[PDB]
């Protein structure tokens, strides 16, 4: 018999006054962090949906946020051209990272969490030292806005994606390009991420398509379709707490879930009233966090038995 999860809405979290841009579960699984165009970052209880606190400081909208390995720090990417490192406990800004000449769009800590990688509209990828806040390297990674940046599991690699239609893998230590995985220019690559085991790369293009690439071989293994995505840089995820699924937001206001192997859509989550720009999968539970744009502004938490 075949398996299909049965995610069902547990909570709806309201509070942001503008479209939500990104949601991320703390590695320890107790928190859900959310960023919004309202220039705020809010902290919520992953299991009770209970609002915890608001963290402010950016002068403009935030496009992305990311947790440190110990769930103690948070880094944010904003249109004010800076990234800010925050102490979640106190909610205060520890460092403001300055260098980008345009909107900072994406960010991530490396597994060690002593480094931060950022992607900007200025077309560069920058690597920052967490303790000092100094910029160690600036990579002329692309010829158009950088949509995503992510470290592989041992932190030796960085994967970037861009509107220039490319996906490049970089050597963290040297900052040199190890490979241009997606070579065609156009369609815009709106999102990239390494698989939990660091062997694959999940990439989304603005042609309603998600693809699983075998990094070492440089070849496409799986394609996932059926959802809508031609306008926004939507976050996509690997779900491995139960059945191995591919999770993603969509421009038709729903959350799509695919069987990773068969590539078949196994469930579509309804409830949001606007584009689901971001989705996140709990690190230990079969829980999904989803967030929507302007006509919704809410974050929904879903749970299944798998």
């Amino acid at each position: 018999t075949p398996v299909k999860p049965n995610y069902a809405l547990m909570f709806t979290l309201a509070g942001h006054t503008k479209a939500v841009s990104s949601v991320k579960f703390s590695p320890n699984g107790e928190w859900l962090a959310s960023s919004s165009a309202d220039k705020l970052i809010k902290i919520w209880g992953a299991y009770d949906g209970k609002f915890e606190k608001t963290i402010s400081g950016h002068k403009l909208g935030i496009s992305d946020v990311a947790w440190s390995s110990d769930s103690n720090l948070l880094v944010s990417a904003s249109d004010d051209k800076t990234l800010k490192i925050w102490d979640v406990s106190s909610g205060k800004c520890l460092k403001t990272l300055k260098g980008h000449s345009n909107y900072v769009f994406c960010c991530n800590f490396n597994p060690q969490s002593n480094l931060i990688v950022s992607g900007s509209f200025d077309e560069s990828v920058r690597i920052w030292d967490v303790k000092t806040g100094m910029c160690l390297k600036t990579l002329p990674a692309h010829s158009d806005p950088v949509s995503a940046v992510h470290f592989n599991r041992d932190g030796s690699l960085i994967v970037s994606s861009s509107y220039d239609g490319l996906c490049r893998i970089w050597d963290t230590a040297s900052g040199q390009c190890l490979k241009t995985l997606i070579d065609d220019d156009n369609p815009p690559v709106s999102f990239v991420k390494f698989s939990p085991n660091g062997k694959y790369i999940l990439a989304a293009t603005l042609d309603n398509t998600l693809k699983l690439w075998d990094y070492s071989k440089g070849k496409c293994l799986k394609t996932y379709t059926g959802h809508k995505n031609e306008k926004y840089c939507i976050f996509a995820n690997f779900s491995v707490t139960g059945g191995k699924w591919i999770v993603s937001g969509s421009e038709d206001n729903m959350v799509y879930i695919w069987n990773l192997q068969t590539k078949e859509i196994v469930q579509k989550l309804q409830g949001h009233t606007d584009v689901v720009i971001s989705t996140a999968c709990h690190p230990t539970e079969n829980i999904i966090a989803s967030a929507a744009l302007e006509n919704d502004k809410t974050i929904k938490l879903w749970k299944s038995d798998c």
């Binding site: 503008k18 841009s21 165009a37 909208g61 926004y232 720009i277």
Partner: peptide
């Protein structure tokens, strides 16, 4: 601005 096109 990830929220805008």
């Amino acid at each position: 601005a990830r929220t805008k096109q």
